[PDB]
Write a protein that binds this DNA or RNA. Sequence first.
DNA 1: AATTCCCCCCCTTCGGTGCTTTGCACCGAAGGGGGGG
Lengths: 398, 553
Amino acid sequence: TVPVKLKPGMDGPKVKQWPLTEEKIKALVEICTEMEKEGKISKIGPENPYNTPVFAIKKKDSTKWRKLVDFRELNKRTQDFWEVQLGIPHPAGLKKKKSVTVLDVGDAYFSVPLDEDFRKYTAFTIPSINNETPGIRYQYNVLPQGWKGSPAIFQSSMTKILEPFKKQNPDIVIYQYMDDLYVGSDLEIGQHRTKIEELRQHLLRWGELHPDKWTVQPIVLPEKDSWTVNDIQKLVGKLNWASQIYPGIKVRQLCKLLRGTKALTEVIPLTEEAELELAENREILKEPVHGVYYDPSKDLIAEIQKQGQGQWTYQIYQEPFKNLKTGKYARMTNDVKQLTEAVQKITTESIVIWGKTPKFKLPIQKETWETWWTEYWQATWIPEWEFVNTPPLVKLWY
Amino acid sequence: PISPIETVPVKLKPGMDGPKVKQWPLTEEKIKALVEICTEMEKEGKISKIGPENPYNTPVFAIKKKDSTKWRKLVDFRELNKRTQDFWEVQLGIPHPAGLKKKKSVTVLDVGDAYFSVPLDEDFRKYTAFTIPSINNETPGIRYQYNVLPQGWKGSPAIFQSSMTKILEPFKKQNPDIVIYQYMDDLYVGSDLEIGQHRTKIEELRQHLLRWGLTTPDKKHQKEPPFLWMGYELHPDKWTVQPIVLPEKDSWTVNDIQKLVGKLNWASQIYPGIKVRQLSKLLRGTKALTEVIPLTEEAELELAENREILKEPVHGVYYDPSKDLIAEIQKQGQGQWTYQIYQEPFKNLKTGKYARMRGAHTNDVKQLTEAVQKITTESIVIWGKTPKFKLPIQKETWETWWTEYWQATWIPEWEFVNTPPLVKLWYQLEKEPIVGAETFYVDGAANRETKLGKAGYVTNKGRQKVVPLTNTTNQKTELQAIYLALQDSGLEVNIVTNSQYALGIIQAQPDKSESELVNQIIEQLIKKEKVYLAWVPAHKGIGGNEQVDKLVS
DNA sequence: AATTCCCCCCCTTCGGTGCTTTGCACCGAAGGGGGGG
Ligand SMILES: Nc1ncnc2c1ncn2[C@H]1C[C@H](O)[C@@H](COP(=O)(O)OP(=O)(O)OP(=O)(O)O)O1
Ligand SMILES: [Mg+2]
Ligand SMILES: [Mg+2]
C-alpha cells in the first residue's frame, strides 16, 4: 500500500452528518450492507473522532442509487497527492476536441486496499429515521470514491490498462480528474459511440460534451436611436465599471450631457463627441480582454448571477476584474435545480479547460442550498462553495 | 452484572497526564450515601480498592435521583475530560412520538445500572481513581478505581450507546417485524401480534439482554398504557407531553423568566399558538440572573394567552405512511409564525412556532421562506419525507417575488390557503422611469472626524434644501437624504443616488428593520404610489449629482 | 455556592470576517433556559 499522510499540523474531517430522506436511507443501508460483506467498509465505534457527511444520488437515468461521500474537507488536509502528482497532467488539447465523453470508472477504485493508518479519517455515519437508533458508523478499507487520493494511487493501474487502447488510437485524448474518464475524440458522433464501447469493452476485460461550442461572452452596449437622460445615466455607470475591466474606456464625451439638474425622462440631443465615444468604446468591448493568463498556483473563483426567466451568468476568474471565461447558462419553475445544474456545467467546463474545480460564489441563502442541493446533484465531485449577498448594481453583465 | 461485551479502547490526549484534583469536604448525608453505594459496587466488582501505587484522584459527589431514596454517584471528571481523547457521538437527535406508527402492542423497558454494566478499558482504569472520605477525618479515606463506565466522563455516553447497539443487533436481526426505539438505555418495543405473543417476545428480549449483563428490573418495566416514554404519555391512539407546570409568581427575576420561556418552547410542539417574543424581549440588556424585572403589559398579555392555552388538554396522533403529510403555516405578526403538521384535518401530528429574526432588514416573504425551510428540515428528520405546504401567500405574489429577486428561492409543492392575515409585498419599485414626475438628485456627506454630516435633495424643478445631521456616519446621512427626498415629494417620485448601500437596503423590499431611519423610509415608501430608484456614479462629472455633492459638502 | 457527562431545541451577546461602505451586515460559538438518558 501507499503511506498516505496529512498536512503538517492538521487534524482531519469532523463534519456533522445532515439528515437524509427516507428513500436515501433505505437505499443507503442496503449499499453499505453489501459493501461490508465484500470487505470494502467495516464497522467502527465512537473512539474514532473523525466523520464525513454521506448521501445517495440517483444518477442520470440509471434507476439505481449510488453512495456519495462529501470528502471536500478530507481533500483539503490530505495533500499527499504525490504519486505521479500530475494526475494525467491536463492536456491543453482536450478543450479543442470536437467531442468528449464522460465515463464513470467507479468499481475500479474498490479493488486496491487503503492504507491502514488512513482508514480512520474516511469515517461516515448513517442516520436513522426519527432517530430510532444511534447512527451506524463505518470506515473504508478500500480506496473511496470522491477522495482526491484515490486517482493519485490508482494512477499506476490505469495507465497500463489504457496502454493497449490509446496506443492504437493516438488521436484520442483521455483525461481522468477524480472518478470519471474524459475521453476526447475527434471523429463523427456516430463513430464516437463505437469508439466508446471499445474502450468500455477494454475496461471490462482488463479490469456527451461538445467543447467545440464554448466561447467567452463579452459585455454589449445597447443600440437605440432615442437617448433619454436615464439611458446615458445607466450607460455611464456601466462604462465606469467597464473601465476597470476594459482599460482604455473614456467617458469624458459621455459625462458631459449629464451636466445640470435637468429632468430624467427627457430625450437628450446626442452630439458628435458622444457618438464617436460611443462607437470607440463599443469596439474595445468587442474584442475579449487580453493580458490575462491562468496561474496554476492560485485557485479559480466562479460567480453565478440570476438574470430571471431561467437565464444565469457566470464569470470564472482568478483575480478581480480579470475574467478568464464568461458564459450564460439558459434554462433546462424550480430555482435551486437550475442553480444546481449551473454549478455542474461550470465545474465540468472548468475541469475540461483547466483541470481544477473553481471556488463557487452561489447567489443563494445557505439554509436554502443545504436543504435541497443533494436532491438535484448528479456528479461525483463536489466543489467548494461560498454564499454571497450582493444586489445587482447596474445590471453589468446582461 | 458486568457484561461480557468488549471494551472500547480509550486513551489520553498525547503528552497529557492523569488528573490529580483533591476532594472537597462533603456533607454527612452525602458521605454516608457514598459509603453505602461504594460497598455494594465494590462487592460486585464495579470498583476496586487501590493504594499508594495510584497517584490520581478526582472529586466525587452524589446527587439525588429523579425517584427518592436513591443517590446517583457522580465524579467531577472535568480535568480528565480536558485530557481525554476526542469522541464522535453517535446520538444524532431525539426520537419524537409523532414519527411513531400505530403498533398493536407496546412495552417500555429501562435497563438498571446502565453505565455500571459496561466494562471500562483496562489501561484507562487507573485515571478514574477517587477517594471516599471517612466522616470526621477518622481514617485518611478509602481510595477506589472504576472497573465500569463512570458517570460524568466525556466518553461514557457514546461507549454505552455503541455497546447497547451491538448487544441489540442480533435480536433485531432475528426479529425484523418488531420495532425497537432505543435511547441510551430506554427501550420502546412496539410490534404487532396479540398481547400473549408480544409478552413472550418481550421475555425473550429480556433474557437476551440478561445474557449480556444488562438487567431490566420489574419496577422500570411498563406493560400497560399510558406509557411514560421520553417525556411523553404514549396512548394506544394518541400521545401527550407530560404535564407542564408554569411558575406562578408575583415578582419575576431574570432567571425565572428564562425558566418560563424554556418551558413554553417545549410546550409549543403540541400546543398551538404559543408566543414568547414579548417575554423573551425582557432578557435583552440584563446583567444579573437575580435582577428583578417587572412585566411590561405586553409580556403580561402573552403570559395570560399562553396560560389559557395550556389549560386545555391537547393530543397528537401517530404517523400513517399510507397517507400524505400536510403542513399549514399562519402569521402572528411582528415576525412570528405558527405551523402545524397533520395528515387528517383537525388531527395534528405536530405543532410548532418560528420567530427567529434573521438580518437587520427583512419582510414577510423571506421569513415565510425561512419557516418553510425549518419545517422541511424538521419533517425530514422526523418522518423522512417533505410535507405539502399550505401557505398564506398568493401564487401571484410568490411569482412576482422569486422571478424578480436576485437570489435563488424555492419552496416545495404548496397550495395557497385563504386564512385572513396574508403575506404580501407592501411596495414595489418600478423598473422604468415614470414620466411627469419630479426627479430628485439626492446626496449625503459626513466628515469622518467630528461626526457632522449634511443631506441634500436638489431636484429638477428647482427645489433644494440642505439639512445638517449630528453624529452620523457616511451611510446614515445618505439614508437621511433619501428620507428627506421622499418626504418632500408628491405621489410619483424618481430618486437618484450615488452609493450602493441605500439601494441595497431598499431594493430588497424591506418592511421592518432594526434601525429607525430605514423604518421611516419604509413607512414613506408605502404611502407613495410610484417610486423609481436609480443609481449614478458620484464623482464622475455627473451634473446635478455633483451639484448636490457641493451642497451636502 | 454549588460543583458531573452526552444529545436535540430556542433566545441573547460578542467576537471574527468580508467589502470597502474604516462602518455595517452575517455568522458562529458561547452563556442562559427547556426536554431526554
Ligand atoms: N445526571 C446525570 N449525570 C450523569 N450521567 C447521567 C445522568 N443521568 C443519567 N445519566 C446516565 C448514566 C446512567 O447510567 C444512564 C441511564 O440513566 P438512568 O436510567 O437514570 O440511570 P441508571 O440506569 O444508572 O439507574 P437506574 O437503576 O435508576 O435505572 O444515563
Ligand atoms: Mg428512566
Ligand atoms: Mg436505567
